[PDB]
Amino acid sequence: VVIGIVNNTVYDPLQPELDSF
Amino acid sequence: VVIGIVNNTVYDPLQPELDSF
Ligand SMILES: *[C@@H]1O[C@H](CO)[C@@H](O[C@@H]2O[C@H](CO)[C@@H](O)[C@H](O)[C@H]2NC(C)=O)[C@H](O)[C@H]1NC(C)=O
Ligand SMILES: *[C@@H]1O[C@H](CO)[C@@H](O[C@@H]2O[C@H](CO)[C@@H](O)[C@H](O)[C@H]2NC(C)=O)[C@H](O)[C@H]1NC(C)=O
Ligand SMILES: *[C@@H]1O[C@H](CO)[C@@H](O)[C@H](O)[C@H]1NC(C)=O
Ligand SMILES: *[C@@H]1O[C@H](CO)[C@@H](O)[C@H](O)[C@H]1NC(C)=O
Numbered sequence A, B: 001v002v003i004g005i006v007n008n009t010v011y012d013p014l015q016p017e018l019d020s021f
Helices: A012-017 B014-019
Strands: none
Touching: A012 B014
């Protein structure tokens, strides 16, 4: 729906702390 | 860089939710 939206990664800070746990 | 900064612990709430799993 958003006119002009762009693709980028969004960093989830939880994911690596689960990955290291 | 901060004039007058003080040392204290900062509680991360996710760390114990991992540690208690
Ligand atoms: C942003 O990402 C989406 C998803 O990868 C891209 O959408 C695809 O575009 C191609 C054509 O270039 C289509 O054949 C695919 O079917 C599309 N995927 C989906 C899920 O619809 C989109 O093109 C990307 N935007 C830019 C500017 O690169
Ligand atoms: C806040 O903590 C830092 C350490 O994290 C203290 O810095 C040390 O200070 C001593 C002298 O008191 C130096 O010999 C060390 O080299 C310092 N450590 C580092 C890593 O630079 C700092 O003094 C503390 N602040 C207060 C007001 O106690
Ligand atoms: C800016 O203009 C281009 C065409 O010149 C258009 O394809 C694009 O969607 C527009 N971007 C935004 C953010 O409106
Ligand atoms: C207040 O003054 C003391 C010295 O009297 C100094 O060490 C400290 O950095 C100062 N704190 C601030 C917030 O300016």
